[PDB]
Write an enzyme that holds these catalytic residues in place. Sequence first.
Site, PDB file in Angstrom:
ATOM      1  N   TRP A  15       1.575  -3.050   3.824  1.00 58.78           N
ATOM      2  CA  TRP A  15       1.561  -4.379   4.386  1.00 58.78           C
ATOM      3  C   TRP A  15       1.314  -5.364   3.237  1.00 58.78           C
ATOM      4  CZ3 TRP A  15      -1.302  -5.311   9.548  1.00 58.78           C
ATOM      5  CH2 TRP A  15      -1.041  -6.571  10.005  1.00 58.78           C
ATOM      6  N   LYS A  33       0.041   3.431  -2.966  1.00 57.66           N
ATOM      7  CA  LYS A  33      -1.078   4.372  -3.045  1.00 57.66           C
ATOM      8  C   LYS A  33      -0.579   5.790  -3.221  1.00 57.66           C
ATOM      9  CE  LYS A  33      -4.710   1.700  -0.612  1.00 57.66           C
ATOM     10  NZ  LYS A  33      -4.009   0.457  -0.503  1.00 57.66           N
ATOM     11  N   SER A  59       0.767  -1.218   0.000  1.00 56.79           N
ATOM     12  CA  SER A  59       0.000   0.000   0.000  1.00 56.79           C
ATOM     13  C   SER A  59       0.808   1.284   0.000  1.00 56.79           C
ATOM     14  CB  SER A  59      -0.998   0.039   1.159  1.00 56.79           C
ATOM     15  OG  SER A  59      -1.912  -1.076   1.013  1.00 56.79           O
ATOM     16  N   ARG A  72       4.435  -0.788  13.104  1.00 57.97           N
ATOM     17  CA  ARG A  72       5.242  -0.048  12.125  1.00 57.97           C
ATOM     18  C   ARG A  72       5.357   1.408  12.602  1.00 57.97           C
ATOM     19  NH1 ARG A  72       1.258  -1.626   7.368  1.00 57.97           N
ATOM     20  NH2 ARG A  72      -0.040  -0.861   9.028  1.00 57.97           N
TER      21      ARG A  72
HETATM   22  B1  LIG Z   1      -1.860  -2.120   2.044  1.00 59.32           B
HETATM   23  O1  LIG Z   1      -2.152  -1.480   3.389  1.00 59.32           O
HETATM   24  O2  LIG Z   1      -0.496  -2.744   2.054  1.00 59.32           O
HETATM   25  C1  LIG Z   1      -2.986  -3.200   1.725  1.00 59.32           C
HETATM   26  C2  LIG Z   1      -4.296  -3.020   2.176  1.00 59.32           C
HETATM   27  C3  LIG Z   1      -5.228  -4.001   1.909  1.00 59.32           C
HETATM   28  C4  LIG Z   1      -4.931  -5.181   1.324  1.00 59.32           C
HETATM   29  C5  LIG Z   1      -3.677  -5.419   0.820  1.00 59.32           C
HETATM   30  N1  LIG Z   1      -3.254  -6.557   0.118  1.00 59.32           N
HETATM   31  C6  LIG Z   1      -4.062  -7.358  -0.520  1.00 59.32           C
HETATM   32  O3  LIG Z   1      -5.281  -7.328  -0.514  1.00 59.32           O
HETATM   33  O4  LIG Z   1      -3.345  -8.370  -1.151  1.00 59.32           O
HETATM   34  C7  LIG Z   1      -3.960  -9.486  -1.803  1.00 59.32           C
HETATM   35  C8  LIG Z   1      -2.723 -10.264  -2.222  1.00 59.32           C
HETATM   36  C9  LIG Z   1      -4.818  -9.015  -2.992  1.00 59.32           C
HETATM   37  C10 LIG Z   1      -4.842 -10.259  -0.812  1.00 59.32           C
HETATM   38  C11 LIG Z   1      -2.748  -4.443   1.089  1.00 59.32           C
END
Ligand SMILES: *[B]([O])([O])C1=[C][C]=[C]C([N]C(=O)OC([C])([C])[C])=[C]1
Length: 245
Positions: free
Chosen positions: A191, A54, A51, A231
């Site tokens: 994450w 973004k 993320s 984090r």
């Molecule tokens: B981000 O905060 O890194 C983030 C938020 C929500 C969901 C994800 N990852 C995600 O959905 O990854 C899959 C592999 C599609 C389940 C990251």
Amino acid sequence: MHISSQQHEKAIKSYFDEAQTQGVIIIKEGKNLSTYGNALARANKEYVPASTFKMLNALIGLENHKATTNEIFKWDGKKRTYPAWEKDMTLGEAMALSAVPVYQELARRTGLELMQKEVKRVNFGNTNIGTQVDNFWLVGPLKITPVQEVNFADDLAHNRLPFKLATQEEVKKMLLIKEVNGSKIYAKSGWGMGVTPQVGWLTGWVEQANGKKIPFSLNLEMKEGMSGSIRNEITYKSLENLGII
Ligand SMILES: *[B]([O])([O])C1=[C][C]=[C]C([N]C(=O)OC([C])([C])[C])=[C]1
Ligand SMILES: O=C[C@H](O)CO
Ligand SMILES: O=C[C@H](O)CO
């Protein structure tokens, strides 16, 4: 001041060790990069941005008129992982909540060809987005190192990226996560869910009261059971130890 480098390095290492993970935090002061933590070799290793992408997705979408900052992205009514995503929100709200669905919609508006062109144009990480416009930051093939992330943060903080000034300012507004005695912390967490091991990130900068900006990037392994706030906690303790906040 009077505290030795040995003592700062031991302290920051301990924040990672106490969390029972492995990680690094890179700090940039002017042009100089300093690497702290308990797994310093991570600094030039590639991970998915998760993320943290973004920030770039927003810059691209705004610059290319795929959204506005006031636009409300409506929830489709389908079940989400978290209740906070089952709501209508702007890009800035989605940034704070790390609402992947909003940013997947934005990515689909931009579309593969433009997205690839823009990621290349900015020189972000390994620059490769592959064929799937809606998950390339999550599962590969896009990857980036902690040094590259802190350097991206430095670019954004100083309006150096190849976007309009106003585009950069808009995105920066979305990233304010904490105010601590006169300092402001602008950052975005990441994450990597569904990569293994799972990566955790917090990448951004401190704007001090005097106007100096001190970019940072924390990178660690997220473990079973771990809260996302670790984090932030490690980051803030490190910045405080060094006197940056
Ligand atoms: B981000 O905060 O890194 C983030 C938020 C929500 C969901 C994800 N990852 C995600 O959905 O990854 C899959 C592999 C599609 C389940 C990251
Ligand atoms: O990954 C495991 C931990 O760093 C052990 O203290
Ligand atoms: O290290 C950082 C540069 O910003 C990307 O190649």
